[PDB]
Ligand binder design. Structure first.
Ligand SMILES: Nc1nc2c(ncn2[C@@H]2O[C@H](COP(=O)(O)OP(=O)(O)OP(=O)(O)O)[C@@H](O)[C@H]2O)c(=O)[nH]1
Ligand SMILES: [Mg+2]
Lengths: 339, 166, 679, 183
């Protein structure tokens, strides 16, 4: 009962005119409701979600970065059940991606939560987003390229989804860890990203794309020699005896700068030989009935209804109190239920 | 018989409820449930004067959350909180103070800053020095604290009443 | 914009302050936030007076949302606590205007202000804390009666810590807070279960302290409990200022008051003053022996200088309170008033004359005829001429005798420097003379008008000469009236200052319009119809509009061409202000001159409807409002003629009512809807 | 379409209007109201160095003649708001006074006696620099009004005596009105 009442009152506000001030409040409540319910939250989805997505398109950008944070929160609790509304979500994301640190951060965090929600299903919605992803790496004004770091940290999570689109997405990753200008942190993330992707994709096509830049990075910058070796080592592990071509070529930089990794040395030697492995606050509003005019009794009522909402043991009413002060008909309508 | 209202703001999952409930009740285990307006009460004396504290344990404000209007009308104190086991909490707490000063104008309002989870040495990333300098830069007090010691949190709520005394 | 109003704001820190505050109210209406917040903040800290003037100017003028109420409260908590006075009063007044903001943190706010105020009355700190707290409690009680009454139990248990503390300025204040809350108690206790515990508490605390520093405080509390317990006699006091549980103990407080009066008369002049406010008040409560000691105390104090200007008020209010017994002392008292008035504060002498005459009745008359030639010898006070109005009205036999001298006084002022002329002219119009001789006065007011480089003689000579010409048959009055109106109306068009141009034109009533109908007068009014100032145009269209019946051949053509110019402004000017003003003026032109419009109903109405249908007159609300207001009046005139258009408008209007994005004040839309359906 | 609030294009477009008006003559009256929304938007606000955009547009408006008849009530207010306002750079202000002087030779001003006269009177007081210019506007305005001016004579006279101002043209006409015989 309780979640259902609150959800109806909230959504009755959640329609333009009153929300001009009280968007944020409503969405904070909802997100707390679903967080509290478990997977029984799922029943409210078709009520919330159509309005919710339309709010994002309608509202001002003052709010909009917040709504996406909370959308991504809804996504996470609901998990795969969001699949029906995914088209609209991707349309929204696609509309409100721009080349500005402001929004990009949040949207990328949304993707992070979508991927983990849908899992195998995300593969379908990926290609609507690749055009934006490649546009991020290609050019980015972000201080220390941290936008692109977060997006790398997103791409780390795609797993087997990324299969059909690795040939798109692997080149611009490589162009980070080769280029001299690029600030060291971003560059590191790109190397560590290729390391993650190795554990859940195949790289046999892209032996030459990856290996030559690693080899280059080993020469130019001494700072990433450990990092790049730990990328290469895993790439070798995944390739297996397909690596036998490259051994000498790479060896000629490995001897040049005297570089030692257990992991690498082990695997090369292993390849060549061939064998891999609650009531005290309430009491003030109860009998404060020393009242005489209209205003005196109404103000008894107001304060009573709100005093109820604070207490009420159900989290799905507690939530509303915050709103119930700022908009009084929220307390009015939950009064009976609150009581 | 004086009555003082105190707001504990901050980032979420830091230990606002942990401290607040430690002071008021005195138990190691606490409510591991994300709170929206968890009010409390407590009777304590500070230098002879009787103080009824009314403690507003607020829902933890994120990087973007528009600042409440309940707190710009009532309160004689703000215990702004971060946790020493993340940089996340520290960047957030700077912007809470940002928005709070944007909400009330800039008047000499009784603030302090609080570093919870000092007992966690091995997950610590913020130092005593940074927060001390940040507190000093605001013209505000500092403490480190621990919800594991009722002793420490007692010393916190005493500090804020002494700041509001001035 | 921001630096301009900043220069104005820092100027208000240095009459100039209040003027710049009125300009600030006009500028906030024309609308930014944080720049003006920073401006207030930096005028606040150093100068403080301007901060309060600005804070008070912006509460309500904006439509003050919660971000304003968050800030303004926190500013005003660091003005009061530790202060020096004047600033103190205006800070708590601003808390008055603020605590009735309308935002739902009013309970929260007023609970906080009052709890904090009562904590400053719980330890003898800085006596500025007391001064502050009490001025706050008073102003919250008046402005916010509900939420203040909510905190009454600690309140009556904490002012009797704090009338008694050794101070002079606190006493007046701490009894003013008690006065406000006891005025709330009067309106409540009819419905509560039994009678209260409070009035007893009040009287008993006053008595505990009464039995030098403690007398004055006790007497102020008695002044209050006497005020509430007999709502009759205070009316009397207030009337002269314009120009039942105490029943159990009324002999105890009487014996207490008179004994303490005569036995602290040669000590202080404070305690004497509060006694001169009790005796008239207790006389009106219960009407011999007390009265002789009373009047001996009072009449002895009239020769002495400090209390005299209060002693007269007491003498006056006692002449109502006990009428019959006072008739012994009239030969004594008239000597006092006689000695008060041989010409050179004196206001109260004149108020005593009004009450002395008013109360006992018209059995002084000939003695007051002996008083009149004294009173007039003073000159022209505001108090005097107000008293002579009261006296003529109530004692009717002295109607002629008053105005005999009062004119050959005023004549002597305006045959024969500057600020007196204003009040002489105000008198000349503002109470009723029965002389034809006024015909000379109006023609001599041609001198005052034309000249007077002083603005105020003009603006008042106007307001006189309109009022005096009310005899507007025979051929001498007629030539005079017409001779004045020419000169008078000339000023209404020609005068450089807008305020006189407004005043003159507004005063040209329906009374005159048979003179305004003449060609020449009418040619002048049409010049007004296209004035520099908008408000004057709005006035003149109404005026000419009235006359379009009277002399239609001149008017009706001009008004048609005016109508065309108006509709041109509506369609073809891209500016919003112009369209807004245009539609507004069309409103007037429709309502006022209906005969003109009833043929041009279709064109006007299409042009109006087509404003409502467009998508980009949303940047100004007033176009849509004033268009709807016009349709209301256009509906009124048309009647059945405008039937076929009602369906079109009805859809439009009902579409506006729902979904206020086309945010007209629904007041206007509902009004028009009502008007259509009515017509 | 190609009017914007930028000195770049506005100059040229205004020169175009100048050549259209003289081309069409009486016919331009029809196409005028499509352009008034832009004209009023120029005076109302303008970032032009020394307000020279609005000078050129004044110099255009000088040429409209009898076309401007039906729209003078629109167009005369913002012209007046130049020659009254303290801030305005002197050259623009002069052009606006001289503009009202041109328009007097080919329109009627009897409606707008009060709109024009009071600001002229104001300008005579505040700024001494335009006292000759403003008198030559007023003089012509009096010439056009005729004995309709008889109301204003004294009011204006009270600034004419204050600053001791002498124009042949004005003095002649006032004396001529009071006695009653105009050429
Ligand atoms: N081990 C340990 N845990 C602590 C300490 N202080 C706080 N915590 C933990 O911090 C966790 C998160 O804090 P909460 O009190 O649940 O959350 P909150 O700070 O109230 O913030 P909201 O969730 O926004 O209300 C709790 O699970 C506590 O156990 C400490 O000194 N030691
Ligand atoms: Mg909590």
């Amino acid at each position: 009962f309780y979640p259902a009442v609150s959800m109806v009152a909230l959504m009755r506000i959640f329609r333009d005119q009153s929300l001009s001030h009280h968007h944020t409040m409503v969405v904070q409540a909802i997100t707390f409701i679903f967080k509290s319910l478990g997977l029984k939250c799922v029943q409210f989805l078709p009520q919330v979600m159509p309005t919710f997505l339309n709010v994002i398109r309608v509202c001002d950008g003052a709010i909009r970065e917040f709504l996406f944070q909370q959308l991504g929160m809804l996504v996470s609790f609901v998990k795969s059940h969001i699949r029906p509304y995914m088209d609209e979500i991707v349309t929204l994301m696609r509309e409100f991606w721009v080349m500005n640190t402001s929004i990009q951060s949040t949207i990328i965090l949304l993707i992070e939560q979508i991927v983990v929600a849908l899992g195998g299903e995300f593969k379908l919605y990926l290609p609507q987003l690749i055009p934006h992803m490649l546009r991020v790496f290609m050019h980015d004004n972000s201080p220390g390229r941290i936008v692109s770091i977060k997006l790398l940290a997103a791409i780390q999570l795609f797993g087997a989804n990324l299969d059909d689109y690795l040939h798109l997405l692997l080149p611009p990753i490589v162009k980070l860890f080769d280029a001299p200008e690029a600030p060291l942190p971003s560059r590191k993330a790109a190397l560590e990203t290729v390391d993650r992707l190795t554990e859940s994709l195949d790289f046999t096509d892209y032996a030459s794309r990856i290996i030559h830049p690693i080899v280059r990075t080993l020469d130019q910058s001494p700072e990433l020699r450990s990092t790049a070796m730990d990328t290469l080592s895993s790439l070798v592990f995944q390739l297996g005896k397909k690596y036998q071509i490259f051994i000498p070529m790479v060896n000629k930089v490995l001897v040049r700068h005297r570089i030692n990794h257990q992991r690498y040395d082990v695997l090369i030697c292993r390849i060549v030989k061939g064998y891999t492995l609650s009531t005290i606050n309430l009491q003030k509003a109860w009998g404060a009935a020393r009242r005489v005019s209209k205003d005196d009794w109404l103000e008894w009522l107001r304060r009573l209804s709100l005093e109820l909402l604070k207490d009420s043991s159900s989290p799905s009413l507690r939530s509303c109190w915050a709103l119930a002060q700022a908009y009084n008909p929220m307390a009015r309508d939950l009064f009976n239920a609150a009581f | 018989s004086k009555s003082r209202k105190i707001a504990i703001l901050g980032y979420r999952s830091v230990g606002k409820s942990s401290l607040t409930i430690q002071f008021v009740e005195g138990q190691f285990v606490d409510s591991y449930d994300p709170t929206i307006e968890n009010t409390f009460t407590k009777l304590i004396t500070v230098n002879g004067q009787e103080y009824h504290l009314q403690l507003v344990d607020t829902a933890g404000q994120d990087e973007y959350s528009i600042f409440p209007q309940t707190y710009s009308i009532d309160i004689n104190g703000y215990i702004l909180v971060y946790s020493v086991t993340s940089i996340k909490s520290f960047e957030v707490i700077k912007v809470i103070h940002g928005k709070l000063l944007d909400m009330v104008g800039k008047v000499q309002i009784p603030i302090m800053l609080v570093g919870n989870k000092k007992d966690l040495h091995m997950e610590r990333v913020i130092s005593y020095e940074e927060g001390k300098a940040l507190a000093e830069s605001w013209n505000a007090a500092f403490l480190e604290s621990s919800a594991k010691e009722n002793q420490t949190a007692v010393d916190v709520f005493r500090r804020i009443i002494l700041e509001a005394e001035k | 914009x921001x630096x301009x109003x900043x220069x104005x704001x820092x100027x208000x820190x240095x009459x100039x302050x209040x003027x710049x505050x009125x300009x600030x109210x006009x500028x906030x209406x024309x609308x930014x936030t944080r720049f003006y917040d920073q401006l207030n903040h930096h005028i606040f800290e150093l100068e403080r007076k301007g901060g309060i003037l600005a804070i008070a100017s912006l509460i309500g003028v904006e439509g003050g949302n919660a971000t304003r109420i968050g800030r303004f409260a926190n500013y005003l908590r660091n003005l009061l606590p530790s202060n020096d006075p004047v600033v103190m009063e205006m800070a708590s007044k601003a808390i008055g205007r603020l605590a009735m903001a309308g935002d739902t943190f009013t309970a929260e706010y007023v609970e906080f202000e009052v709890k904090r105020a009562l904590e400053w009355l719980g330890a003898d700190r800085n006596e500025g804390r007391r001064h502050a707290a009490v001025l706050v409690l008073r102003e919250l009680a008046i402005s916010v009666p509900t939420f203040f009454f909510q905190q009454v139990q600690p309140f009556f248990d904490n002012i009797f810590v704090a009338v008694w503390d050794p101070k002079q300025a606190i006493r007046e204040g701490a009894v003013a807070a008690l006065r406000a809350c006891l005025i709330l108690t009067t309106q409540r206790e009819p419905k509560e279960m039994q009678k209260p515990q409070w009035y007893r508490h009040t009287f008993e605390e006053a008595e505990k302290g009464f039995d030098d520093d403690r007398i004055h405080g006790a007497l102020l509390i008695l002044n209050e409990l006497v005020r509430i317990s007999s709502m009759e006699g205070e009316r009397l006091r207030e009337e002269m200022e314009e120009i039942x549980x105490x029943x159990x103990x009324x002999x105890x407080x009487x014996x207490x008051x008179x004994x303490x009066x005569x036995x602290x008369x040669x000590x202080x002049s404070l305690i004497q003053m509060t006694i001169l406010n009790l005796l008239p008040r207790l006389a009106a409560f219960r009407p011999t022996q007390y009265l002789q000691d009373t009047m001996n105390h009072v009449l002895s104090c009239v020769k002495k200088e400090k209390e005299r200007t209060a002693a007269f008020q007491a003498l006056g209010l006692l002449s109502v309170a006990v009428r019959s017994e006072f008739k012994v002392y009239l030969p004594r008292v008239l000597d006092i008033i006689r000695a008060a008035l041989p010409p050179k504060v004196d206001a109260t002498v004149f108020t005593c004359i009004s009450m002395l005459a008013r109360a006992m009745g018209p059995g002084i008359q000939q003695d007051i005829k002996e008083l009149l030639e004294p009173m007039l010898a003073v000159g022209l006070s505001p108090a005097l001429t107000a008293v002579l109005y009261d006296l003529s009205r109530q004692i009717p036999q002295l109607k002629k005798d008053i105005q005999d001298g009062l004119l050959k006084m005023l004549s002597l002022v305006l045959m024969x420097x500057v600020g007196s002329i204003t009040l002489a002219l105000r008198t000349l119009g503002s109470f009723e003379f029965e002389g034809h001789s006024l015909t000379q006065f109006v023609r001599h007011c041609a001198d005052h008008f034309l000249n007077s480089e002083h603005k105020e003689i003009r603006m008042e000579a106007a307001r006189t000469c309109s009022r005096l010409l009310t005899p507007s048959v025979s051929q001498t009055a007629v030539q005079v009236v017409a001779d004045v109106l020419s000169k008078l109306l000339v000023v209404g068009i020609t005068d450089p200052d807008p305020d006189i141009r407004y005043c003159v034109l507004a005063s040209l009533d329906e009374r005159f319009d048979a003179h305004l109908a003449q060609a020449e007068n009418l040619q002048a009014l049409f010049v007004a119809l296209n004035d520099q100032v908008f408000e004057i145009r709005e006035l003149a269209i109404c005026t000419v509009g009235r006359l379009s019946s009277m002399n239609p051949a001149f008017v009706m053509p001009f008004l048609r061409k005016m109508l065309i110019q108006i509709l041109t402004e509506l369609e073809h000017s891209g500016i919003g202000r112009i369209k807004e003003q245009s539609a507004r003026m069309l409103g007037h032109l429709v309502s006022n001159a209906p005969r003109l419009i009833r043929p041009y109903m279709e064109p006007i109405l299409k042009a109006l409807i087509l404003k409502l249908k467009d998508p980009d007159p949303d940047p100004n609300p007033g176009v849509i409002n004033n268009v709807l207001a016009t349709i209301g009046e256009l509906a009124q005139v048309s009647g059945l003629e405008m039937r076929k258009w009602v369906d079109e408008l009805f859809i439009i209007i009902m579409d506006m009512l729902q979904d206020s994005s086309l945010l007209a004040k629904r007041q206007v839309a509902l009004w028009t809807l009502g008007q259509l359906v009515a017509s």
